[PDB]
Symmetry: D2
Subunit: 362 residues, 4 copies
C-alpha cells in the first residue's frame, strides 16, 4: 500500500500534453497502419500490385493532402515500414505529418494469438523487448502507440479468462509505453459480429471497460497520459431489430459514463465495419447526446476515412487529385462530427454508404 | 457475460430521482445517526444524562430549526430510535424532515468487526435480514441509507484483504438496498490517523476507490442510483509537513477524477473530525479547484454541523433558540461551500 | 505481504485435533440438523405431527442407538433447538453424543438469499454476531459448525459473481469459527439438478473448489483446522447419458486431486438426494479409486442414513427398536464404505 | 461456466508420461542452461576464455559422465546453443542425453524486466512467438521447458502487483507449452536475500504458491502435465537466528502441503545459492519429514552439481576424469537424498 512513483512530474506533463494535442477540439486520428497482408487486399480491390513503391505512394497520397486537413487531423498512426519511408521530396513521412500539425503514432503489438481452453478467443502478443522499441520509435519521431485486443460476443464469450487476460496485457503495454515517453492508446475492441441487440452490446462493453480500468489501476497507469479506443455501442451486425442514431449514441455514452474515469484525456472511436457516412453520423449523434461527457469524444478511423479515396485513386497516378479530394471531404466531415456540428448533404458518394464490414476470419 | 436486469426502468428512475434530490445545487446532508453509545461521550461533554428523552429533545432541536436551513439541507440521516420518535406537537420526525424539503436517511450497518490475521483491521457486519429491514424502513419514510466501512493507513495497512473484503461487503449492501427502493450511500472511510503525508493519503484513496467501483460493477450496482461518501484527501493528523487548502483540494479532486465514474450522481464528504470551520473551508476550495468535476461535491457532516449547537444547548431547554442559531449558521456556511462561494470573513505534481 | 498470526500454536493444535477425531479411519458424520420447516415434510410422510416433543423423540431415537454405531460415528450435527434438548433420562443431547465417542456439531448459517442481477442464483447469510454465537455454542458442547452455500449448473450458471461471492462468504465464516475454537466445515454444494453430464459436473466442481481455496488463503484460514463437504462428481439428475460407479469415483477423486491441498484434514461427502444404498456404493468406489488420496474420504449424510429408520418408526413409540436397527444398518454400511470394504451383496479421459 | 477442452486424452497422456519419467524414483534434474553472459562468470572464475568451443567442452564433460549417473538424472535442461551442439563423436547432445535415460529440457524465457511503480520488482518476458519456438524445440528433441520468475522479500515486497503479474505470465507460458507437447516447469523463485526469518519466508511462499495455482486454474492448465520448481523454505541470508535442517524441512513441506494440489506430478527444488553439501542434506531432510507428501520431492540443481567439477577441470583437458568424478559424486548423493536415503558416508507441526 506504499507509493513508488512510476513517473516524475516532468514525465507526466509530457504525456498529458501529447494526449491533449491529439484530441484537441475538432481533431481526430487517421489510422493508416495497415500491414502488408491487410493493405494487400485493399490494393487488390483496385487491381494494384502490392509493392513497396505502391504502398509508399498511397501513404504519401493521404499524408500530403492540402492544408484543409490540418485542423482535422490531430494524429496519424503508421506501420513500421511507413515510419521509415520518405515522400518524393525526400522528407521522411514523420516530418511531413508534423509539419502539418499532427502527432506521429506507431503500431507496436505483434497480433493476436489463440487462448487454449476457450471457444475461439484470443489475447495479444508483443511485449518482448517493447521497451527498447519504444525508446527507438520515440527518437525516430513517434509520440504515441497502438495496441489492439479483440473480444467477441457469443453464447459463452467473452469469457472470464479472455476479459481478465486481455485487460492485464493492455496494462503491461501501457506501463512500458509511459516509461519511454509514449502515450498508450488502450484498445479493447468488442467485435460487432453476431445477432445480439443493442442492450447486450452495452452490457458487455460495460463489463469489459470496468475490467480494463481496474487493471490499469493495479498496474499504476497514469490515465491523463492515455487515450481510449473502444467500439461504439451498437446492435450486432446480424441483429434483426433496428435502432436510431440517437439510441446508439445514448447507449454508447451511458456505457462510457459508467466505466471511464474523468481523468482519461480522450476517447477515439473505431468504426468497425461502419460505412464512411454511418461512422460520421453516429460520432456526431454521440457528441450531441444530452448526457454529460468529461472526455473528448472523437475519431480514429482507418477505412472509414480512406474508402472513397482508395476507389477514386484506382492505382492511377493521374488520379492523385481526385483521390486526395475524397479523403479531405471525409476529414472535414468527421472534424465537424467530433464537435456535434455535422449534417450530411448532397454530394456524398455511393462508396461512402457502402458497408465496410468483414466477418472475423478465425 | 449475460444480462439479467437487476432493476426495471421504473425502479431505476426512482433511485436516480432520490439521489439527485439529496445533492441538488446548494444542498447537503446532516448526519445525526449517532447511537446511544456513540452519542454518550457528547452528552457527557455538556453534562447531560443520556436518556431517550434528552436524545429526542436534541434531535428535535436540530430538525425543527427555522426555514433558513430548508435550501441547505437535502438529506438527514437518522438512527433507528429517532426514525420512530415524534416532536412535541405530535408530528413524526420523518414528516418534519420532509415538510422542510429534506429526504430521510437511515443507518443500517451493525458496526465493525475485527479481521483475523491482520494488524488491527476490520470489516463491517449488518447483511443478515437487511432486505426485510430496508422494506420496513422504506414503508416508514426512509429513501436512502448509511453503511460505514473503516480502513487505516499504517506500515502494512490497508492490506489486500481489508481492501478486498470491505469493497465486497459494500457492494452486497448496495445491491440489497437497490432492490427495496433505497439509495445506498457507499462509505469507504480511510482514517486520518497517523503521520503519513498528503501524497500517501492520495495514493491509498485512489487504490481503495478503484477497488470499490470494480466491486460495485461485479455486483451489478446501478451507479446513477447511489452516492459516495469518502474522506477528503489530507495528511495524517501527526504529519509534520504543512499544506494549504488549495493543495488539499487539488489532491482530493485529482484522486476522485482518476477513479469515480461520471455516472455517480454525487459525492458527500465526511468531516472526519475536522472542525466546523475547517470542514467548510476545505469543501469550498474543493469546489473552486480548476479541474472539471462531473459529479456534485457536497457535505454529509456530523460534528462539523452540530459542535457549536450542542455546546450552546448544554441540556438547557432555555437555550433552544441560541443552540439552533449555531446549527443554522453552519448549514448556511456549508451550503455556500458546496457552491464555492464561502468566505469566513502544476497539477502534474499530483 | 506481512504476517500477523491469526492463531497461536495452541489454538491450532486444538482445531487440528478436533478435525482429526471427526474423520478418524472408519468414521463419518450424521447430519441431523434439519430445521422445523425442513423436517416438516419428513414427519408428514409418516402422518406425524410436527411438534417439539415428536422432534425431540426422533432425535433421541437416533442419538441413543446401541454401541455398534460408536465406531462408525465421529460426529453429529445438530440444529439449535436440539442442542438444548434432553433425552428421557435427563441427559443433555450433547452429553449423549460425547459419551458415545462422537464430536458435537452445530448449524450456524441463516439460509440463502437471492443475488440481484443473476438468473436465480444465491449466496448465504449468517455472519452477523456469529462470533458471540460460536463462543456460546462452544461453552454448550459444540466443537464444529455447519454452513451451506448453494450453486447450480445451468446455461449461464454458476456465474463469476456467484462463485466469487459464495467463496468469499465461506472464508469469512471459517475465519470467525477458528477464532472461537470451532472447526468450520466448508460446504460449497453444487446441486445435481439438471441434464448436464459427468464431465460438465467435474469441470464446474474443479473451478468452484479452486475459487474456494484461493479465498480461504486470502483470509488466512488454517486448513488443517477445517473439513470439506462437497458434492460428489455425478451426472445431472436428469442426464440422458448413464455412467457406472467406477466412473463417478474417478471423476470425483480426480477433481479433488486437482484442487484440494493435502493440508485439508478430511472430506465429508454430502448425499444430495441419493438413495441409502447408492450413497454407500459411491463412497465405497471413491475409496477404491486407484489414485493417491492425501485426505480422509468419508461421509456426512442426512436422509441417506435416516430414510429407513424414519419409515420403520412411523411415529409409533412401539417401533423404537426396529427404527434404530435400520439406522445402525446404514451406519455400518457407510463405515465400511469410507474404507473401501463395503459389499452390498486410462484416467487421462478425465 | 462451460468447458472447451484445451487438450485431448492423447495429449494429456503424453504430457503426463513425460512428467513422471523426469521425476521417477531416485532421479532429479541437472540445470546446465547458463547463458553466454551467465557462463562468462563461471569460466572467468577458473581463468578460461569464454569461447563456444570451451562451453561445448564443458557441457560435454557433464553430459558424457559414466553410466553411474543414469539412475540419478531424469532430465537435463539446456540453453539454446547447447541443444544444437554435438559430442566429439558427432552425436547430437540431445541424443547423448536420451541414450543415458534422461529427458531433454530447454530454457524458453527471455529474462526479467522491471515493473514500473514498484520497489525494484520485476516480471519475466518471452511469450512472443513462443508457440512456434516450442514446436521447433519439440521436433529437435526437447520434451520439457524452463521459465523463471523472480520475487523478493522486503519491506513492501512481494507486492500485490508483482505476485499477480508473475503468476499470470507463468500461466500463459504453461498454456502455450502444453499445446505443443512440452511439459512446463513452473518456477516462481522467492530470493533468499535479506535478514528475514524462517516464519516470514514460509508465509510469503504460501501466499505466492496460492496465487500461482489459482492462475494455472484460470488458464485451464493440466497439472498432471507440469512440475513445480520452488525455493526451499529457509531464513534470509542475513538472518541472525539459526535453524536446523529438520526445521527447514518442516517449514518447506508444511508450505507445500497447504498450497500444492496432489495432482502436481512433482517438485524439483532450486538450490538458491546453497553449498553442494547443504543442498543435499536439506533435500534429504525434506524427504524424511514425518508428513504426507503426495508428490515427488527431488532436485533441479545448477552449481550445487557443477561447483566442484568446474574447479577440478580448471579449463585443462588433462583434468577431465577428475572433473567428471566430482560431478558423479554429487549426482549420486542427491539421488539418495530425493529418497531420504542420503548419509555423509554414502549409504511441533502446530508451531508452523
Amino acid at each position: 500500500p506504499h507509493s513508488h512513483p512510476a513517473l516524475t512530474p516532468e514525465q507526466k506533463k509530457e504525456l498529458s500534453d501529447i494526449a491533449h494535442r491529439i484530441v484537441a477540439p475538432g481533431k481526430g486520428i487517421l489510422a493508416a497502419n495497415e500491414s502488408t497482408g491487410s493493405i494487400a487486399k485493399r490494393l487488390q480491390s483496385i487491381g494494384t500490385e502490392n509493392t513497396e513503391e505502391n504502398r509508399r505512394f498511397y501513404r504519401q497520397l493521404l499524408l500530403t493532402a492540402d492544408d484543409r486537413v490540418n485542423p482535422c487531423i490531430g494524429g496519424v498512426i503508421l506501420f513500421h515500414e511507413t515510419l521509415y519511408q520518405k515522400a518524393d521530396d525526400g522528407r521522411p513521412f514523420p516530418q511531413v505529418i508534423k509539419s502539418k500539425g499532427g502527432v506521429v503514432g506507431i503500431k507496436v503489438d505483434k497480433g493476436v494469438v489463440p487462448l487454449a481452453g476457450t471457444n475461439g478467443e484470443t489475447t495479444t502478443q508483443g511485449l518482448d523487448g517493447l521497451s527498447e522499441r519504444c525508446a527507438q520509435y520515440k527518437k525516430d519521431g513517434a509520440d504515441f502507440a497502438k495496441w489492439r485486443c479483440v473480444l467477441k460476443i457469443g453464447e459463452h464469450t467473452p469469457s472470464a479468462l479472455a476479459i481478465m487476460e486481455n485487460a492485464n496485457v493492455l496494462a503491461r503495454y501501457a506501463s512500458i509505453c509511459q516509461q519511454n515517453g509514449i502515450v498508450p492508446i488502450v484498445e479493447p475492441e468488442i467485435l460487432p459480429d453476431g445477432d445480439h441487440d443493442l442492450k447486450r452490446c452495452q452490457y458487455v462493453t460495460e463489463k469489459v471497460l470496468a475490467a480494463v480500468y481496474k487493471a490499469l489501476s493495479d498496474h499504476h497507469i497514469y490515465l491523463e497520459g492515455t487515450l481510449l479506443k473502444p467500439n461504439m455501442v451498437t446492435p450486432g451486425h446480424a441483429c434483426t431489430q433496428k435502432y436510431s442514431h440517437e439510441e446508439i449514441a445514448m447507449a454508447t455514452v451511458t456505457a462510457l459514463r459508467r466505466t471511464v474515469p474523468p481523468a482519461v484525456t480522450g476517447v477515439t472511436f473505431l468504426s468497425g465495419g461502419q460505412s464512411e457516412e454511418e461512422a460520421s453520423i453516429n460520432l456526431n449523434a454521440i457528441n450531441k447526446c444530452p448526457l454529460l461527457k468529461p472526455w473528448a469524444l472523437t475519431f480514429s478511423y482507418g477505412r472509414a476515412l480512406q474508402a472513397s479515396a482508395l476507389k477514386a485513386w484506382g492505382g492511377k497516378k493521374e488520379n492523385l487529385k481526385a483521390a486526395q479530394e475524397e479523403y479531405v471531404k471525409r476529414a472535414l466531415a468527421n472534424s465537424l462530427a467530433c464537435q456535434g456540428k455535422y449534417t450530411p448533404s448532397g454530394q456524398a458518394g455511393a462508396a461512402a454508404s457502402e458497408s465496410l464490414f468483414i466477418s472475423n476470419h478465425a
